[PDB]
Amino acid sequence: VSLVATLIANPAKAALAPSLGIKASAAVNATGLYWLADDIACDIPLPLGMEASEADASLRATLDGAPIDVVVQEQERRRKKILIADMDSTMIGQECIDELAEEAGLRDHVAAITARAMNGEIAFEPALRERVALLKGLPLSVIDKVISTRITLTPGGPQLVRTMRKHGAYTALVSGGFTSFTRRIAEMIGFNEERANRLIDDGTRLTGTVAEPILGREAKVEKLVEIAERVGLTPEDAIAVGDGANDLGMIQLAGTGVALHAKPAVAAQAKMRIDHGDLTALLYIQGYRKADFVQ
Ligand SMILES: N[C@@H](CP(=O)(O)O)C(=O)O
Numbered sequence: 240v241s242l243v244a245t246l247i248a249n250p251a252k253a254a255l256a257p258s259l260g261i262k263a264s265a266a267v268n269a270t271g272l273y274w275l276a277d278d279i280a281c282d283i284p285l286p287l288g289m290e291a292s293e294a295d296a297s298l299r300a301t302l303d304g305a306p307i308d309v310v311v312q313e314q315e316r317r318r319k320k321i322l323i324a325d326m327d328s329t330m331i332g333q334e335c336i337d338e339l340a341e342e343a344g345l346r347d348h349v350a351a352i353t354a355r356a357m358n359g360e361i362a363f364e365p366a367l368r369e370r371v372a373l374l375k376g377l378p379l380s381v382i383d384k385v386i387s388t389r390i391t392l393t394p395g396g397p398q399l400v401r402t403m404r405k406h407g408a409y410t411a412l413v414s415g416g417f418t419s420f421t422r423r424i425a426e427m428i429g430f431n432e433e434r435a436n437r438l439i440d441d442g443t444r445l446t447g448t449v450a451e452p453i454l455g456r457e458a459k460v461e462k463l464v465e466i467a468e469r470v471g472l473t474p475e476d477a478i479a480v481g482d483g484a485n486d487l488g489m490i491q492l493a494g495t496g497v498a499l500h501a502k503p504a505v506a507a508q509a510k511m512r513i514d515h516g517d518l519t520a521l522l523y524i525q526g527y528r529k530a531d532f533v534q
């Protein structure tokens with residue numbers, strides 16, 4: 240029944256100063272205080288008989304004004320053995336759909352749909368169909384043009400995935416985006432597997448359609464189920480991280496589910512939030528020390 244709280248800063252704004260650690264440590268009346276990364280993350284072994292509802296409040300209030308995330312959990316079962324991760328806006332900095340939209344002159348028009356889809360105001364599948372329709376007649380060349388010139392990796396991402404593969408964890412990049420993107424991005428970051436939707440083409444141009452049945456909110460949950468049976472585990476052994484409504488099924492089902500820099504209504508719904516850290520936050524959530532990372 241033993242607890243632990245973890246404080247995480249962004250490694251590029253490492254404001255978790257030694258004095259804050261002690262302060263927070265004593266706000267929750269804690270014994271140990273264990274440093275995972277100097278000025279970035281620390282473990283506060285909670286005292287028994289304290290619902291995380293309180294330890295959250297104590298720590299969030301003590302830390303108020305500082306760019307430091309708080310999560311509380313049980314110390315055992317912290318290191319997950321599956322990672323299932325969103326691509327667009329989670330592991331890359333862009334929306335692959337919105338970037339292709341630039342190549343048709345409608346980035347602004349399509350990004351507003353994307354925004355509403357990822358907030359959960361519209362279902363993913365008609366949102367994909369509507370946005371993808373406007374890519375009709377686009378040549379296939381635009382794919383690598385966008386990957387090469389406008390796609391960039393979210394900080395912490397290679398480190399996160401490489402460091403879990405080092406500890407025997409299966410890592411899947413599970414996206415509502417497009418296989419021509421996820422196949423490259425996943426090899427680039429270091430995933431074992433990727434699964435995304437598929438654009439249809441005639442051999443030169445994009446048809447403007449997507450291969451049906453579309454993978455949406457539900458298909459991310461099933462991929463999580465498929466992977467867990469396949470590897471001899473349950474989804475409780477998984478950590479899931481995304482930003483939009485199509486990740487909520489998989490975030491809610493995983494043993495550890497993380498709304499990372501999530502849209503307004505999405506973070507409103509998630510139990511565990513990271514609003515300041517980068518992708519290394521998930522390593523510190525899992526109890527890794529910076530010693531244990533892959534450089
Ligand atoms: N957000 C993207 C795809 P994803 O984040 O699931 O990788 C979209 O709107 O199509």
Ligand SMILES: [Cl-]
Pocket residue numbers: 417418419420436437438
């Ligand atoms: Cl594709």
Ligand SMILES: [Mg+2]
Pocket residue numbers: 325326327328329481482483
């Ligand atoms: Mg996303």
